[PDB]
Design a protein around this ligand. Sequence first.
Ligand SMILES: C[C@@]1(Cc2cn(-c3ccccc3)nn2)NC(=O)CC1=O
Ligand SMILES: C[C@@]1(Cc2cn(-c3ccccc3)nn2)NC(=O)CC1=O
Ligand SMILES: [Zn+2]
Ligand SMILES: [Zn+2]
Ligand SMILES: [Zn+2]
Ligand SMILES: [Zn+2]
Lengths: 197, 197
Amino acid sequence: SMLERTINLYPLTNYTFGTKEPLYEKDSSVAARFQRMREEFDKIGMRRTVEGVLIVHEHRLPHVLLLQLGTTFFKLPGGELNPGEDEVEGLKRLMTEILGRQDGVLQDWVIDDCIGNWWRPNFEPPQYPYIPAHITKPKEHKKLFLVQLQEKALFAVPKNYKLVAAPLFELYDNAPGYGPIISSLPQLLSRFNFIYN
Amino acid sequence: SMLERTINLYPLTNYTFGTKEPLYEKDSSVAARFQRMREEFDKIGMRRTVEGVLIVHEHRLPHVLLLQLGTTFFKLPGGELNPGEDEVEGLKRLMTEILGRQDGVLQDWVIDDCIGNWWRPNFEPPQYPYIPAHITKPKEHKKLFLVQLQEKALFAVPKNYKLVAAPLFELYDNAPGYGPIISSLPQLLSRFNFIYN
Ligand SMILES: C[C@@]1(Cc2cn(-c3ccccc3)nn2)NC(=O)CC1=O
Ligand SMILES: C[C@@]1(Cc2cn(-c3ccccc3)nn2)NC(=O)CC1=O
Ligand SMILES: [Zn+2]
Ligand SMILES: [Zn+2]
Ligand SMILES: [Zn+2]
Ligand SMILES: [Zn+2]
């Protein structure tokens, strides 16, 4: 009856958060964001994005690491794949670009579990955990993965972002605060057997 | 990068829904339900419940089988474990009790995946996908499993219930209609690679 995946969690104090240069968004506004999505869709079709869920604990309470753009939006570490790029190799590349060290030592990213899929039917904000009715050409497909951290690590956070450890209760039923993907992480993580090391 | 579990789905017209005698609830009201939960907690501690998610398709659109008590509440097939009872053997027993055949031929239930965990902190309706802060003695633990159906089957539905195939869009963000567990099935199912046979 042990059908659950077992995942090792480590204290937040096991991890060192250094700083490095700002990492600027491609798009300077929502309007530019949807213009670029439309231009690239006509060239190379559906956008493929990947996002990593990194979990720690303090005193046996799990927390998800989120990246806050100044004091505005909360984001998962991740981003856009290149055409023909493998999903796992691409998430590892993107997580190195975002949290990789100034001294250029490699993190050992371990990615073994898909935890969800979201689809964007139009060049507009709405996203769903399925392809909606009558939609033959979705504009974006987003894939979420659970990233198993090592016991200790040094991460370099771009100076324009703050790394924040969010407890699950703060995410739960808070789409206004976090939107529909991050707010449903508590439900998506409930199947795992966490070990509090 | 194929980290997803692959699941075979079959058309709803592949399945025959017969009828059998009513199957009556132990508790004739919410108030009796929480009285029995309190009496049993003092004798044998935390209630352990198990629930099965059974998926079909029509024209390549997935649907979850729900059991409607007349025209009131929607339920997953499942129920309460006995003390010392294995979770998987118990869900198989409960699904036979509910949907098992009048002719007494065994269904071949295949249960290979946990899809979530919910906890009830008090003798009250609220349930969460984690144990809330300061709660040392939760009153109920509910475990959800994905049940892989065979290509064809005959199910006997108790005359007091109706079997309904709900498309995912109807569940999504509809807790008033379905409550917080069934309404989050779209998110919990998004990680699977469904084959539409
Ligand atoms: C190509 C790339 C790479 C990229 C990802 N991020 C980022 C994502 C999460 C957290 C912090 C930073 N910043 N640039 N540039 C964009 O504007 C979107 C995108 O995918
Ligand atoms: C012991 C038992 C068994 C049981 C389960 N169900 C049922 C569950 C889902 C759908 C249709 C029927 N009806 N009786 N009696 C109760 O009143 C709760 C319980 O667990
Ligand atoms: Zn401690
Ligand atoms: Zn897709
Ligand atoms: Zn068809
Ligand atoms: Zn428990």
